[PDB]
Structures are given as structure tokens and as C-alpha cells.
């Protein structure tokens, strides 16, 4: 709290994303918090580590942070909720990503 600061706010929020099973997904979200919130990513409550098996996180200090899914499958279908946690509080926004099952997917 204190003073001389600005509460976190998603000046660019996520939306309802849709993808075919096995295909890559790229999405990003921008905040106007001050100080710049330590943007955290987690999927259905599952904390995401930057540069994981399929979950690549890139946080720009400018205020824009991106999350890329290399291969979004039915097990990756869910809500990639983003949290703008900073000294002035925290705000959650739903990163909904739905996956269409593909019967022709040999990697399924």
C-alpha cells in the first residue's frame, strides 16, 4: 500500500481463445500497474514455470507479458488465469482456452 503508486489494472485483458488439438497457441496481456505487477501465470490453479515443457512465459518490464503454448491438447484445455500481483494489490483475469478434439491427430 502506502502512497505514490497505482493499483494493478489489465489495460489489455485476455479473451476466450479457441484452438485445434495439437496446435500452438499464442496470447498476451498488458497491465498498467505501478509498480509493474509481477505477472504470474497459472492454469486452473496450476502454477506455470517460465520456459516449461510447452508453457513459455515472456514478461516484458514495459508491462506486457505473454504466454505461449507449444502444443495445446485436451489436457491443456482450461483457464490460463493471469494475476497482476503487486505491492498495491492483485487482480485476476481468465485466460480461457478451449481445445477442439481432433480425431486425425496422430499425437493424440
CATH number for position 33? 2.60.40.10
In DSSP notation, 7-75 reads ----SB----EEEETT--EEEEEE---BSPP--EEEETTEEPPSS-SSEEEEE-TTSEEEEEESS--TT
Please state how this structure was obtained.
Answer: NMR
Residue 13 lies in domain: 1-108
29 has which bridge partners? 65
Q: How many residues are listed for the chain in this entry? A: 108
Is residue 29 within 8 A of residue 57, CB to CB? The reply is: no
Domains identified in the chain, total number: 1
Residues 67 and 55 sit within 8 Å (Cβ to Cβ): yes
Amino acid at each position: 500500500g502506502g502512497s505514490n503508486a497505482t493499483a494493478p489494472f489489465f489495460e489489455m485483458k485476455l479473451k476466450h481463445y479457441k484452438i485445434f488439438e495439437g496446435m500452438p497457441v499464442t496470447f498476451t496481456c498488458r497491465v498498467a500497474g505501478n509498480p509493474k505487477p509481477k505477472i504470474y501465470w497459472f492454469k486452473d490453479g496450476k502454477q506455470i514455470s517460465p520456459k516449461s515443457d510447452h508453457y513459455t512465459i515472456q514478461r516484458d518490464l514495459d508491462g506486457t507479458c505473454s504466454l505461449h503454448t507449444t502444443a495445446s491438447t485436451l489436457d491443456d484445455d482450461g483457464n490460463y488465469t493471469i494475476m497482476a500481483a503487486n505491492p498495491q494489490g492483485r487482480v485476476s483475469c481468465t485466460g480461457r482456452l478451449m481445445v477442439q478434439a481432433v480425431n486425425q491427430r496422430g499425437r493424440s
